[model samples]
Target: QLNLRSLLVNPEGPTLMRLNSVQSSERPLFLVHPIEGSTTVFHSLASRLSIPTYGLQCTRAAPLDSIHSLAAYYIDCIRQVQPEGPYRVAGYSYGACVAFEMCSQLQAQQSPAPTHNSLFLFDGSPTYVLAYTQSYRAKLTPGCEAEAETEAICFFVQQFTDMEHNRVLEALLPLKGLEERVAAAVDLIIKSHQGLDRQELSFAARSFYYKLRAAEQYTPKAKYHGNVMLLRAKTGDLGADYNLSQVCDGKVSVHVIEGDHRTLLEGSGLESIISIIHSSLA
Candidate 1:
């Protein structure tokens, strides 16, 4: 019978996606997918980078409770394309935490290899989600996991619809199953983003919900012994650094650039990030 486990399993897609066509022998950069679980947003950065860039997009929607496991899964995906290190890895927001874990895991597998490998985080902090989860858990009673899941579902669909969150909850509460609720939410997204594939959006939302659960349970346990280059947006919620010094045993270089988290991905902010990457790779 279909259950939460089955409902959350999405059709698989390519785990590694090439973001640019730079014809150079320089080591390609591997970027982990953010909370959205999609790499489509990296095209702008990819276009500006001096080296070829590959994105580790999410192909599995199964519930993974820790970033360590998620990073292990990504290491395998990256190795499929680039078998060896000095691997270059980076991420924005939630993806940065995964990238950090990948660096840690790589160092564990092969000592001194990751000293040459690089990690970059764009306005992402490992403990940022802890604050979010703290407030999220405060509102819920014990054993209200199903209710929490429903709230998570609404949070994912809220971006597509202007309908009140209460209305969305009302629509989903009566649904017989998770599959039905997701299908109904897909209907709402379709009205706003016309011509997009219905099944694709449904998969994205389901994948996002699974990622939400996974990220909520993630915490910084192990220390990474490699330098981290963190790019922060001037107007971002956190300070110049994403707080990598606490989790990293190596140097943490912070670069504050123009724009907030969203805007930092484009325009002048992106240009600044590209330059830092090029300089670091030199």
Candidate 2:
């Protein structure tokens, strides 16, 4: 009696992917994907997890031109999918920011208190770059620093799509090392260019980048009063003094995995991620 349906919330936008269950058992887990990446990127991890998982595929929403809109959109999707209590949430990179916002929104609505199980942030730093614009203003100008940060933020947006696409290719065609992975990813990108132009891709990439940059400044309406977990890679540019305790406070705990962000979802790293999720669920 789940009455699952596939419908497009935004007629002109991407179709929302949803799943429902009326078992009245445990709450479903909502997994939000990074910008420019589809829900499919989480398919393997979602399937491996011991809980029912749902993904939110967001389409560009203007006026609503920020992660706040994306977060609100996902919350609306969750409302339609479950409509009530007892649900968990997780997100990766940009998605994590949305996830936090969704949790805050749910709390504000004072809806049936869902057991907030766990909030998972995978290699996501809430370090707002825009906030740094003010500090950089004295050295340069406010607008110049803002523009530079905005440009640099594009790298992250690209990383989201690039990493996921590369992972898919690697999964399909086993690559030997990082070099092979990069090569395979490039090949896939080239093959996808049958009718695609650089402009279209650039626009899409910039849109996602701006959205994420905007999200970096978003403050949650309500604090996520639940168990939080920050999954970080062992070797990455995660900064020298990266302190999870300060960033997440005591409510959050840190878990260091064996591989970087990309590898964290593959091979042994994948196994470890699943294990942590299961243990957290228990």
lDDT of 2 by residue, 19-131 (tens): 33324456677887665445655767876766677777655543236656767777767777688754578777666667766665666566545454467777664442233
Leading candidate by TM-score: 1
- Residue 281 CA error for candidate 2 (Å)? 1.7
Clash-forming residue pairs, model 2? none
Q: Could you estimate the TM-score for every candidate?
A: 0.87, 0.66
Off by over 4 Å in 1: 1-12, 61-65, 112-114, 174-177, 191-195, 237-240
lDDT of 1 at 227: 83
* lDDT of each residue in 1-282, candidate 1, tens digit only: 212221222247677878898887889999877676677668899988879999877765423567878888888878887887888999888787778878888888887554678988877868665556667667767676656666767876786667798889888766776677778888886776666577767877776666767777776667788888888888854345556667888889988889987789899998888889999986
